[PDB]
Design an enzyme around this catalytic site. Structure first.
Site, PDB file in Angstrom:
ATOM      1  N   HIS A  39       0.824  -1.217   0.000  1.00 33.90           N
ATOM      2  CA  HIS A  39       0.000   0.000   0.000  1.00 33.90           C
ATOM      3  C   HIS A  39       0.869   1.282   0.000  1.00 33.90           C
ATOM      4  CE1 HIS A  39      -0.068  -0.225   4.559  1.00 33.90           C
ATOM      5  NE2 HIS A  39       0.076   1.088   4.412  1.00 33.90           N
ATOM      6  N   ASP A  77       0.766  -7.796   2.700  1.00 29.05           N
ATOM      7  CA  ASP A  77       1.086  -6.432   2.361  1.00 29.05           C
ATOM      8  C   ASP A  77       2.587  -6.155   2.450  1.00 29.05           C
ATOM      9  OD1 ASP A  77       0.720  -3.698   1.878  1.00 29.05           O
ATOM     10  OD2 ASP A  77      -0.769  -3.447   3.495  1.00 29.05           O
ATOM     11  N   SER A 157       3.416   2.656   8.357  1.00 31.21           N
ATOM     12  CA  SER A 157       3.371   1.629   7.315  1.00 31.21           C
ATOM     13  C   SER A 157       4.791   1.332   6.838  1.00 31.21           C
ATOM     14  CB  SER A 157       2.620   2.179   6.112  1.00 31.21           C
ATOM     15  OG  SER A 157       1.261   2.414   6.435  1.00 31.21           O
TER      16      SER A 157
END
EC number: 3.4.21.-
Length: 200
Positions: A39, A77, A157
């Site tokens: 992402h 991810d 992230s």
């Protein structure tokens, strides 16, 4: 129990394994090779840049161009990012990326109740690329999923999830209730090792 602390100096290990994108974090896993979330990588392109362990505007390990992006085939991810080995802006140890950073090693495993640390760049625009470290307990380890109760925010992230000996147990991808990371299973480790840059 949980602790969050602004990092004073980022040019010492383990902080020398961490990198900043404009909006998120990553960390070094091998020769010219970084790991972040899918992402995160989807917002960048070949030619975009990363900075090695910035400490706001007080110094860093250099600025490097992204030369390749390899997304994990499974649903996890995870994305591998290769950088051009010669810095766009030099670090203190010459133009070579590999001379300015320290890759992380993998833990043998992780268990519920162990204390982990997440190191990364929370809200990097607001905080001006200040590194924070955040600790807390592992809640569960099931397949490629590691769940932990440590404070994380937007910007985290792609942060490494480390054990007490600064070894990788996972890569952070989602905040909140607990935080979720991708646990390094053999299939994921195989994907990473296969896509570490060989160089030239």
């Amino acid at each position: 129990e949980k602790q969050v602390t602004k990092v004073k100096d980022t040019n010492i290990f383990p902080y020398t394994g961490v990198v900043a994108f404009k909006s998120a974090t990553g960390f070094v896993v091998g020769k010219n090779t970084i790991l972040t979330n899918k992402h995160v990588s989807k917002n960048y392109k070949v030619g975009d840049r990363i900075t090695a362990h910035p400490n706001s505007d007080k110094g860093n390990g250099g600025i490097y161009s992204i030369k390749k992006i390899i997304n994990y085939p499974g649903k996890e991810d995870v994305s591998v990012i290769q950088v051009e080995e010669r810095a766009i802006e030099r670090g203190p140890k010459g133009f070579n990326f590999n001379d300015n950073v320290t890759p992380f090693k993998y833990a043998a495993g992780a268990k519920a109740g162990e204390r982990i640390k997440v190191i990364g760049y929370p809200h990097p625009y607001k905080n001006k690329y200040v590194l924070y470290e955040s600790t807390g307990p592992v809640m569960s380890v099931e397949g490629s999923s590691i769940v932990y109760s440590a404070h994380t925010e937007r910007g985290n992230s792609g942060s490494p999830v480390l054990n007490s000996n600064n070894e990788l147990v996972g890569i952070h991808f989602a905040s909140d209730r607990n935080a979720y990371g991708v646990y390094f299973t053999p299939e994921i480790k195989k994907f990473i090792a296969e896509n570490i840059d060989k160089g030239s």
